[PDB]
Amino acid sequence: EIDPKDLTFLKELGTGQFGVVKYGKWRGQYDVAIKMIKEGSMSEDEFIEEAKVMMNLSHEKLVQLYGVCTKQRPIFIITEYMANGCLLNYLREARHAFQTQQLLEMCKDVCEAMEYLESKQFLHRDLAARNCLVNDQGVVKVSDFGLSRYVLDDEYTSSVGSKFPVRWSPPEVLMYSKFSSKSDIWAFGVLMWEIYSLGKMPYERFTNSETAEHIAQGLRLYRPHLASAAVYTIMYSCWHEKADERPTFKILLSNILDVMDEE
């Protein structure tokens, strides 16, 4: 529970699923991002009850939750601040002129954070490049893991909603609402595709509806030009028809480390 007197608001960072997010300072020292939870957007009591668990998720490659301000409205969520923002926009800036080793390192950063979440049996449920952030050192961290459960907007939480992450979802999620560790694995494979394609929309010439059909017929994202056969094999393994044949994040990490040493 952070005291709001210890917070100063400095600049707007943007708008997310819970409304505005600001950059600011905590205890006049520490850079923070501060979510200002838009009223009616969030199942607040549920989030408050379970913010403990999330506060104990602590990994270098997770965007760290520092605290909450819940004795007021709107409530605040205070996190680690990531200078370079959103990985999706970072990818799309041609000026970075990334080496492929840098692209694989971005995959590795994310895999580390997901391997940690997996060990804690904690699902992200919305893993994608838009939900990763980049710090001042070019480190990628996984953001907003687990917060999908508190979203009140039906366009977001429904499979058929205009905001649902259809393109990052396995067939069993879309057809049956079968969520598991393997549905995060699927999304992680799509995320690797986003990275190696420098931020293209997955299934860029299909709608959400056509994408659901395409993947239910056993068809998949093509190899991005920048991806080697071995990088392609890693992402593609994430999209096995049978969820139980997809790798774990621990396996994916050893595969990424292998390609790194090899290529």
List contacts with ligand 2V3 (CB under 6 A): 13-18, 21, 33, 35, 63, 79, 81-83, 85, 126, 131, 133, 143-144, 147-148, 151
Radius of gyration of the chain (CA): 18
| 201 annotated ligand binder | no
Q: Is 250 annotated as a binding residue?
A: no
14 is in an annotated binding site: yes
The three-state DSSP-derived secondary structure of 147-207 is HHHHECCHHHHCCCCCCCCHHHCCHHHHHHCCCCHHHHHHHHHHHHHHHHCCCCCCCCCCC
Give the nearer residue to ligand 2V3 in terms of CB position, either 124 or 246: 124
Sheet with 7-16: list strands edge to edge: 7-16, 19-26, 30-36, 76-80, 65-69
Whether residue 76 is annotated as binding a ligand: the answer is no
Query: What's the token pair of residue 254?
Result: 């050893």
Query: Which residues lie closer than 8 Å to 99 by C-beta, 6 or more apart?
Result: none
Listed as own residue / partner, the contacts of 172-181 with beta carbons closer than 8 Å and 24 or more positions apart are: 172/243, 174/212, 174/215, 174/216, 175/216, 178/243, 179/123, 179/125, 180/123, 180/243, 181/118, 181/121, 181/123, 181/248, 181/249
Q: Which is nearer to ligand 2V3, 62 or 259 (CB)?
A: 62
Q: Is 13 annotated as a binding residue?
A: yes
Task: Specify the residue, 35 or 220, whose C-beta has the smaller distance to ligand 2V3.
Answer: 35
Residue 198 CA to its chain's centroid (Å): 16
Please say which residue, 37 or 221, places its beta carbon nearer to ligand 2V3: 37
* 36 marked among binding-site residues: no
Q: Based on the residue annotation, tell me whether 45 is a catalytic residue of this protein.
A: no
Quick one: tokens of 214? 């395409």
Pick 37 or 256: Cβ nearer ligand 2V3: 37
Least separation in angstroms between CB 119 and ligand 2V3: 21
What minimum distance in Å lies between the beta carbon of 51 and ligand 2V3?
13
Minimum CB distance to ligand 2V3, residue 209 (Å): 22
Q: Alpha-carbon distance 67 to 78, whole Å?
A: 5
Closest CB 158 distance from ligand 2V3, rounded Å: 14
Residue pair 239/187 in contact by the 8 Å Cβ criterion: no
Q: How far is the CB of 127 from ligand 2V3 (least distance, A)?
A: 10
DSSP-assigned letter for residue 6: G
Identify the active-site residue in 3, 31, 109, 126. Answer: 126
Q: Which residues are catalytic?
A: 126
